[PDB]
């Protein structure tokens, strides 16, 4: 048999400290190709080890196609190949796009769905998985209006790289997280989910009003905030993102404000579960 391997790289759609993402083509069809820096090799190894353990398949998880390691003269080349989502990341999308009630709920319920799928152990199935770097740049917008969760390079299974500091829960910033305890990692993801819910909700129009896109804590920390900057805001002062008055005129945003509050308790065990968040979102509107 012929094994047509060649992928054509067509367009760079992302470049960062730790690698690049390309739109590519395989057999006339778009794929996404993440090329890792050797500095972030462990993220390729961890995502590859996870998919060699359990082949996740879910409409709200970025679709795996391949992991490739290629020997070069004096280096190793590491690629991850996935489905390609031409609308780009939720972070990208929220910059110019505003939302209505239906599109806002569809986005956040799709994210909750993907996250609950990661978190749940299924017997016979999948181990429970915590993401550990959930944020709007790690969520892609699909053409059908649902999103999918990307980047399992920091993920942990239950049967170097740390999370993005802006999205870190208070127990991560004050180093009290119970590291031997899998439920602790799920509760870190729930905190981060609440921040993503805030980012999205701001862009939902009500009574002709919308907020501009801002990242969580934009008004209290610098760009590329330090670990200490974050700890002082989140742990010492116990600040949370602002809920604008205009949300309390809209039943959807009133319900979403309540939800995001229940993701942000200082006590990790008080936070909602992903399954409970899904149930609450199905009862809104
Ligand atoms: C090695 O590397 C890459 C390979 C491919 C690729 C290309 N054509 C065909 C295949 C194929 C799939 C599956 C089977 C099955 C058939 C049934 N039988 C009982 C078990 C085996 C055979 C062949 C693949 C996997 C694409 C790649 O990238 C897009 C590759 O690079 C990462
Ligand atoms: C990696 O990704 C892609 C792969 C392929 C692809 C190419 N050749 C052969 C295959 C294949 C054939 C047959 C079996 C099975 C069938 C049932 N049973 C008897 C076990 C053996 C498995 C695999 C595939 C899946 C196509 C893709 O897209 C159209 C891929 O996605 C980009
Ligand atoms: C977060 O993580 C990963 C993401 C992806 C991924 C998959 N589909 C699409 C994208 C993308 C496409 C296009 C744009 C822009 C460029 C064109 N236009 C001007 C606006 C839109 C942005 C983003 C990406 C980045 C793949 C990954 O691995 C292969 C990722 O890592 C796991």
Coordinates of C-alpha atoms and ligand atoms in Angstrom, one line a residue:
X1 CA 0.0 0.0 0.0
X2 CA 1.0 3.7 -0.6
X3 CA 1.1 5.7 2.7
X4 CA 0.8 9.3 1.4
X5 CA 2.3 11.1 4.5
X6 CA 3.4 14.5 3.0
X7 CA 1.5 17.5 4.6
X8 CA 1.8 20.8 2.8
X9 CA 2.3 23.8 5.2
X10 CA 0.4 26.7 3.7
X11 CA -0.1 29.6 6.1
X12 CA 1.3 30.3 9.6
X13 CA -1.7 31.1 11.9
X14 CA 0.2 31.4 15.2
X15 CA 3.8 31.9 16.5
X16 CA 4.8 32.0 20.2
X17 CA 7.8 31.4 22.5
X18 CA 7.2 27.6 22.4
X19 CA 6.3 27.0 18.8
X20 CA 4.1 27.7 15.7
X21 CA 0.7 26.6 14.3
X22 CA 0.2 26.3 10.5
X23 CA -2.8 25.7 8.3
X24 CA -1.7 22.7 6.2
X25 CA -3.2 20.4 3.6
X26 CA -3.4 16.6 3.6
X27 CA -5.2 14.9 0.7
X28 CA -6.8 18.3 -0.3
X29 CA -8.2 18.9 3.2
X30 CA -7.2 21.5 5.8
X31 CA -5.4 20.3 9.0
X32 CA -3.7 22.3 11.7
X33 CA 0.0 21.6 12.4
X34 CA 1.6 22.6 15.7
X35 CA 5.4 22.6 15.4
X36 CA 6.9 22.5 18.9
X37 CA 10.1 24.4 20.1
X38 CA 12.5 21.8 21.8
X39 CA 11.9 24.1 24.9
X40 CA 8.3 22.8 25.0
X41 CA 9.0 19.1 23.9
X42 CA 7.3 17.9 27.1
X43 CA 3.9 19.3 26.0
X44 CA 4.1 17.2 22.7
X45 CA 5.1 14.1 24.8
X46 CA 2.3 14.6 27.3
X47 CA -0.5 15.1 24.7
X48 CA 0.9 12.2 22.7
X49 CA 1.1 9.9 25.8
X50 CA -2.6 10.9 26.7
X51 CA -3.9 10.1 23.1
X52 CA -1.9 6.8 23.1
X53 CA -3.7 6.0 26.3
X54 CA -7.2 7.1 25.3
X55 CA -8.3 8.3 21.8
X56 CA -10.6 11.1 22.9
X57 CA -13.4 11.8 20.4
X58 CA -15.9 14.5 21.3
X59 CA -17.5 17.4 19.4
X60 CA -16.1 19.9 22.0
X61 CA -12.5 18.6 22.1
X62 CA -10.1 19.6 19.2
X63 CA -10.0 16.5 16.9
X64 CA -6.7 14.6 17.0
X65 CA -5.2 13.4 13.7
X66 CA -1.5 12.6 14.3
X67 CA 1.6 13.0 16.4
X68 CA 4.8 12.9 14.4
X69 CA 8.5 12.8 15.5
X70 CA 11.0 13.2 12.6
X71 CA 14.8 12.8 13.0
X72 CA 16.8 15.8 11.6
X73 CA 20.6 16.2 11.3
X74 CA 21.1 17.6 14.8
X75 CA 17.6 17.9 16.2
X76 CA 14.2 16.1 16.6
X77 CA 11.1 17.7 14.9
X78 CA 7.8 17.3 16.8
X79 CA 4.5 18.0 15.1
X80 CA 0.9 17.6 16.4
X81 CA -1.7 17.5 13.7
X82 CA -5.4 18.2 14.4
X83 CA -8.6 19.4 12.8
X84 CA -8.4 23.0 11.5
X85 CA -11.0 25.6 12.7
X86 CA -10.8 28.5 10.3
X87 CA -12.6 30.9 12.7
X88 CA -9.6 30.6 15.1
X89 CA -9.6 30.9 18.9
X90 CA -12.4 32.2 21.1
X91 CA -9.9 34.9 22.2
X92 CA -9.5 36.0 18.5
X93 CA -13.3 35.8 17.9
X94 CA -14.4 37.9 20.9
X95 CA -12.1 40.8 19.9
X96 CA -14.4 42.1 17.1
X97 CA -17.6 39.8 17.4
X98 CA -20.5 40.5 19.6
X99 CA -23.0 37.8 20.7
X100 CA -26.7 37.4 21.2
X101 CA -28.3 35.3 23.9
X102 CA -28.5 32.1 21.7
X103 CA -24.8 32.4 20.5
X104 CA -23.5 33.2 24.0
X105 CA -25.2 30.2 25.6
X106 CA -24.2 27.9 22.7
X107 CA -20.5 28.9 23.2
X108 CA -20.5 28.5 26.9
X109 CA -22.6 25.3 27.0
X110 CA -20.2 23.8 24.3
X111 CA -17.2 24.6 26.5
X112 CA -18.8 23.2 29.6
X113 CA -19.7 20.0 27.6
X114 CA -16.1 19.5 26.5
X115 CA -14.8 20.2 30.0
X116 CA -17.3 17.8 31.7
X117 CA -16.2 15.1 29.1
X118 CA -12.6 15.6 30.0
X119 CA -13.3 15.5 33.8
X120 CA -15.5 12.3 33.9
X121 CA -14.1 8.8 34.2
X122 CA -16.0 6.4 31.9
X123 CA -15.6 2.6 32.7
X124 CA -15.0 -0.1 30.1
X125 CA -14.1 4.4 28.3
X126 CA -11.6 7.0 29.5
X127 CA -9.7 8.1 32.6
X128 CA -10.8 11.4 34.2
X129 CA -8.6 14.3 32.8
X130 CA -8.0 17.8 34.1
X131 CA -6.8 20.3 31.5
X132 CA -4.7 22.7 33.7
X133 CA -4.4 25.5 31.1
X134 CA -8.0 26.4 30.2
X135 CA -8.3 29.9 28.7
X136 CA -9.9 31.6 25.7
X137 CA -6.7 31.2 23.5
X138 CA -7.1 27.4 24.2
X139 CA -10.7 27.2 22.9
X140 CA -11.5 27.2 19.1
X141 CA -14.7 28.4 17.5
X142 CA -16.3 26.0 15.0
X143 CA -18.3 27.0 12.0
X144 CA -21.5 25.6 13.7
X145 CA -21.2 28.1 16.6
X146 CA -20.0 25.5 19.2
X147 CA -16.4 25.6 20.5
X148 CA -13.8 22.9 21.2
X149 CA -11.1 22.8 23.8
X150 CA -7.5 22.5 22.7
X151 CA -4.0 21.9 24.1
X152 CA -3.7 18.9 26.4
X153 CA 0.1 19.4 26.9
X154 CA -0.4 20.1 30.6
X155 CA -3.3 17.7 31.1
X156 CA -3.3 15.1 33.9
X157 CA -5.1 11.7 33.8
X158 CA -6.6 9.8 36.8
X159 CA -8.2 6.3 37.1
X160 CA 8.8 23.3 33.2
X161 CA 5.3 24.4 31.9
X162 CA 2.8 25.7 34.4
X163 CA -0.7 27.2 33.7
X164 CA -1.2 30.7 32.4
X165 CA -0.7 32.9 35.4
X166 CA -3.7 35.3 34.7
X167 CA -6.0 32.2 34.9
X168 CA -4.5 30.5 37.9
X169 CA -6.8 29.7 40.9
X170 CA -6.0 31.1 44.3
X171 CA -4.7 27.6 45.6
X172 CA -2.2 27.5 42.7
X173 CA -1.0 31.1 43.4
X174 CA -0.7 30.5 47.2
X175 CA 0.8 26.9 46.6
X176 CA -1.9 25.3 49.0
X177 CA -3.3 23.1 46.2
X178 CA -3.4 19.4 47.3
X179 CA -1.0 18.1 44.5
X180 CA -1.8 14.3 45.2
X181 CA -5.6 15.0 44.9
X182 CA -7.2 14.7 41.4
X183 CA -10.4 16.6 42.4
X184 CA -8.0 19.6 43.1
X185 CA -7.1 19.8 39.4
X186 CA -10.7 19.7 38.3
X187 CA -11.5 22.7 40.7
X188 CA -8.6 24.6 39.2
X189 CA -10.1 24.1 35.7
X190 CA -13.5 25.3 37.1
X191 CA -12.0 28.6 38.3
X192 CA -10.5 29.1 34.8
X193 CA -13.8 28.3 33.2
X194 CA -15.5 31.0 35.3
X195 CA -13.0 33.5 33.9
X196 CA -13.7 32.4 30.3
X197 CA -17.5 32.6 31.0
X198 CA -16.9 36.3 32.2
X199 CA -14.8 37.0 29.0
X200 CA -17.7 35.7 26.8
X201 CA -20.6 37.3 28.7
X202 CA -19.1 40.7 28.4
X203 CA -19.5 40.4 24.6
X204 CA -23.2 39.5 24.8
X205 CA -25.4 42.5 23.8
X206 CA -28.4 43.5 26.1
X207 CA -30.5 46.7 25.8
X208 CA -28.1 48.0 23.1
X209 CA -25.1 47.7 25.5
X210 CA -21.9 45.5 25.3
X211 CA -18.5 45.7 27.0
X212 CA -15.3 45.8 25.0
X213 CA -13.2 42.6 25.0
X214 CA -10.9 42.5 28.0
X215 CA -8.9 39.7 29.5
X216 CA -9.7 38.7 33.2
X217 CA -8.1 41.1 35.7
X218 CA -7.2 43.6 32.9
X219 CA -7.9 46.5 35.4
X220 CA -5.8 45.2 38.4
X221 CA -2.6 43.5 36.9
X222 CA -0.1 44.4 34.2
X223 CA 0.3 42.6 30.9
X224 CA 2.3 39.4 31.5
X225 CA 1.5 39.6 35.2
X226 CA 3.9 38.0 37.6
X227 CA 3.0 35.2 40.0
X228 CA 3.2 37.8 42.8
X229 CA 1.0 40.3 40.9
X230 CA -1.7 37.6 40.6
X231 CA -1.3 36.3 44.2
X232 CA -1.9 39.8 45.7
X233 CA -5.0 40.3 43.6
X234 CA -6.6 36.9 43.9
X235 CA -5.3 35.5 47.2
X236 CA -4.6 38.5 49.5
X237 CA -7.2 41.1 48.3
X238 CA -9.6 38.3 47.1
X239 CA -10.6 40.4 44.0
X240 CA -12.9 38.9 41.4
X241 CA -13.8 40.2 37.9
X242 CA -16.4 43.1 37.9
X243 CA -20.1 42.3 37.1
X244 CA -21.4 45.4 35.2
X245 CA -24.8 46.8 36.4
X246 CA -26.3 46.4 32.9
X247 CA -26.1 42.5 33.3
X248 CA -28.8 42.7 36.0
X249 CA -31.4 44.0 33.4
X250 CA -30.9 40.8 31.4
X251 CA -32.1 37.4 32.7
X252 CA -29.4 35.5 30.7
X253 CA -26.5 37.7 32.0
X254 CA -28.1 37.7 35.6
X255 CA -28.0 33.8 35.5
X256 CA -24.4 33.8 34.0
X257 CA -23.2 36.2 36.7
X258 CA -24.5 33.8 39.4
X259 CA -22.8 30.9 37.6
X260 CA -19.4 32.6 37.3
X261 CA -19.6 33.5 41.1
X262 CA -20.0 29.8 41.9
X263 CA -16.8 29.0 39.9
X264 CA -14.8 31.6 41.9
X265 CA -15.2 30.6 45.6
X266 CA -11.9 30.8 47.5
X267 CA -12.7 27.3 48.9
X268 CA -12.1 25.0 45.9
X269 CA -14.6 22.4 47.2
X270 CA -17.4 25.0 47.2
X271 CA -17.1 25.5 43.4
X272 CA -19.6 24.0 41.0
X273 CA -18.7 20.8 39.0
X274 CA -18.7 20.9 35.2
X275 CA -21.8 18.6 35.2
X276 CA -23.6 21.0 37.5
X277 CA -22.6 23.9 35.2
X278 CA -24.0 22.1 32.2
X279 CA -27.3 21.4 34.0
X280 CA -27.6 25.1 35.0
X281 CA -26.8 26.3 31.4
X282 CA -29.5 24.0 29.9
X283 CA -32.1 25.7 32.2
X284 CA -31.2 29.3 31.2
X285 CA -33.7 30.6 28.6
Ligands
LIG1 C1 3.0 7.3 9.2 O1 2.8 8.7 9.2 C2 1.6 9.1 8.6 C3 0.7 8.2 8.0 C4 -0.5 8.7 7.4 C5 -1.3 7.7 6.7 C6 -1.4 7.9 5.3 N1 -2.1 7.0 4.6 C7 -2.7 6.0 5.2 C8 -2.6 5.7 6.5 C9 -3.3 4.5 7.0 C10 -4.2 4.5 8.1 C11 -4.7 3.3 8.5 C12 -4.4 2.1 8.0 C13 -5.0 0.8 8.6 C14 -5.7 0.1 7.5 C15 -6.4 -1.2 8.1 N2 -5.4 -2.1 8.7 C16 -6.1 -3.3 9.2 C17 -4.7 -1.3 9.8 C18 -4.0 -0.1 9.1 C19 -3.4 2.1 7.0 C20 -2.9 3.3 6.5 C21 -1.9 6.6 7.3 C22 -1.9 6.5 8.8 C23 -0.8 10.1 7.4 C24 0.1 11.0 8.1 O2 -0.1 12.3 8.2 C25 -1.4 12.9 7.6 C26 1.3 10.4 8.6 O3 2.2 11.3 9.2 C27 1.9 11.7 10.6
LIG2 C1 -5.1 9.7 10.4 O1 -6.1 10.5 9.8 C2 -6.7 10.0 8.7 C3 -6.6 8.8 8.2 C4 -7.3 8.3 7.1 C5 -7.1 6.9 6.6 C6 -6.4 6.7 5.5 N1 -6.2 5.4 5.1 C7 -6.8 4.4 5.7 C8 -7.6 4.5 6.8 C9 -8.2 3.4 7.5 C10 -8.8 2.3 6.8 C11 -9.4 1.3 7.5 C12 -9.3 1.1 8.9 C13 -9.9 0.0 9.7 C14 -11.3 -0.2 9.2 C15 -12.2 -1.3 10.0 N2 -11.4 -2.4 10.6 C16 -11.3 -3.5 9.7 C17 -10.0 -2.0 11.1 C18 -9.2 -1.3 10.0 C19 -8.7 2.1 9.6 C20 -8.1 3.2 8.9 C21 -7.8 5.9 7.3 C22 -8.7 6.2 8.5 C23 -8.2 9.2 6.5 C24 -8.4 10.5 7.0 O2 -9.2 11.4 6.5 C25 -10.0 11.1 5.4 C26 -7.6 10.9 8.1 O3 -7.9 12.1 8.6 C27 -7.2 13.3 8.1
LIG3 C1 -4.8 26.4 20.9 O1 -4.1 25.2 20.5 C2 -4.1 24.8 19.2 C3 -4.8 25.4 18.2 C4 -4.9 24.9 16.9 C5 -5.7 25.6 15.9 C6 -6.6 24.9 15.2 N1 -7.4 25.4 14.3 C7 -7.3 26.7 14.0 C8 -6.3 27.5 14.6 C9 -6.3 29.0 14.1 C10 -6.6 29.2 12.7 C11 -6.6 30.5 12.2 C12 -6.4 31.6 13.1 C13 -6.5 33.0 12.5 C14 -5.6 33.2 11.3 C15 -6.4 33.6 10.0 N2 -7.4 34.7 10.1 C16 -6.7 36.0 9.8 C17 -8.0 34.7 11.5 C18 -7.9 33.3 12.2 C19 -6.2 31.4 14.4 C20 -6.2 30.1 15.0 C21 -5.5 27.0 15.5 C22 -4.4 27.8 16.2 C23 -4.1 23.8 16.6 C24 -3.3 23.2 17.6 O2 -2.5 22.1 17.4 C25 -2.4 21.7 16.0 C26 -3.3 23.7 18.9 O3 -2.5 23.2 19.9 C27 -3.0 22.0 20.4

